[PDB]
């Protein structure tokens, strides 16, 4: 039980959960940019709240936010796909995303990942902690003090590992399976990079915020 957490870890989890919970053709794509813009704003507010984030150098703060935006977007998308989208609309979502321009070439691993995540049946607590862990990655491009980020990420990993034992005691490889998904998640940085290239070749245009956060 959550009695397994120290009061300090309990407080940290409560903080994270409270903040996590405070979150046609060419028109289709416009809808996706709008969704992405909206998520970015949510991601900034969650990011700012992470424990110790404020003790990080400002430039490192920014690089963590930029570095994690795509991984975070896909992790939140997996959550929506599994926890919010009726299974019966699954096909609709995919068909519409196809018709936005995005080719099934990279739509395929996207939905595979969503279903992969679904198979782990992650709790909201795991989604919240994974997101925080994604954001606090010490090995992001351009980070100056990786030690300090590693130091903020460590306690979150500890809490998540305890939560894995707690939610699936008889499945000891669960924590590792989650790390496994973090690997699969990271492949989307390249996928998205490919995507923005093509999009910008077809002159897709973007909001200034997305231009900044996605390096277009």
Please give the Cα distance from 214 to 216 (Å, whole number). 6
Which of residues 35 and 148 has its CB atom nearest to ligand 635 in the complex? 35
CB of residue 36 vs ligand 635: minimum separation in angstroms? 4
If one asks whether residue 84 binds ligand 635 (CB under 6 A), the answer comes out as: yes
Among 10, 17, 28, 39, binds ligand 635 (CB under 6 A): 39
Please give the Cα distance from 65 to 43 (Å, whole number). 8
Q: Is 40:18 a contact under the CB 8 Å cutoff?
A: no
On whether 181 is known to bind a ligand per the annotation, the reply is no
**How many residues belong to the site for ligand 635 (CB under 6 A)?**
15
H or E stretch covering 115:
helix 104-119
CB of residue 177 vs ligand 635: minimum separation in angstroms? 22
On whether 142 is known to bind a ligand per the annotation, the reply is no
Among 85, 177, 182, 209, binds ligand 635 (CB under 6 A): 85
CB of residue 1 vs ligand 635: minimum separation in angstroms? 31
Distance from chain centroid for Cα 169: 25
If one asks whether residue 193 binds ligand 635 (CB under 6 A), the answer comes out as: no
Candidate ranges 17-25, 46-54, 72-80, 161-169; the one touching ligand 635 (CB under 6 A): 72-80
H helices present in the chain, as ranges:
7-20, 26-49, 58-83, 90-98, 104-119, 124-135, 146-167, 174-186, 188-201, 208-213
H or E stretch covering 105:
helix 104-119
Candidate ranges 12-20, 35-43, 51-59, 167-175; the one touching ligand 635 (CB under 6 A): 35-43
Give the residue among 213, 215, 216 at the shortest CA–CA distance from 72: 213
If one asks whether residue 35 binds ligand 635 (CB under 6 A), the answer comes out as: yes
Distance from chain centroid for Cα 99: 24
Binding mask 86-125 for ligand 635 (x = CB under 6 A): -------x---x------------x---------------
CB of residue 79 vs ligand 635: minimum separation in angstroms? 8
Please give the Cα distance from 176 to 164 (Å, whole number). 9
CB of residue 54 vs ligand 635: minimum separation in angstroms? 25
First to last CA, the chain: 46
Please give the Cα distance from 70 to 137 (Å, whole number). 13
Instruction: Write out the residues near ligand 635 by the rule CB under 6 A.
Output: 32-33, 35-36, 39, 73, 76-77, 80-81, 84-85, 93, 97, 110
């Amino acid at each position: 039980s959550h009695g397994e957490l120290t009061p300090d870890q309990q407080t940290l989890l409560h903080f994270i959960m409270d903040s996590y919970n405070k979150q046609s053709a060419e028109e289709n794509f416009l809808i996706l940019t709008e969704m992405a813009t909206n998520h970015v704003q949510v991601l900034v507010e969650f990011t700012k709240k992470l424990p110790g984030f404020q003790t990080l150098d400002h430039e490192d703060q920014i690089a963590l936010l930029k570095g994690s935006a795509v991984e975070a977007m896909f992790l939140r998308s997996a959550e929506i796909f599994n926890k919010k989208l009726p299974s019966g609309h699954s096909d609709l979502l995919e068909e519409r995303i196809r018709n936005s321009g995005i080719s099934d070439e990279y739509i395929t691993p996207m939905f595979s990942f969503y279903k992969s995540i679904g198979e782990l049946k992650m709790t909201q607590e795991e989604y919240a902690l994974l997101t925080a862990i994604v954001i606090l990655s010490p090995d992001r491009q351009y980070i100056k003090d990786r030690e300090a980020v590693e130091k903020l990420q460590e306690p979150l990993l500890d809490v998540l590992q305890k939560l894995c034992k707690i939610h699936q005691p008889e499945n000891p490889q669960h924590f590792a399976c989650l790390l496994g998904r973090l690997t699969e998640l990271r492949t989307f940085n390249h996928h998205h990079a490919e995507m923005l290239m093509s999009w910008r070749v077809n002159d897709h245009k973007f909001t200034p915020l997305l231009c900044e956060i996605w390096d277009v």
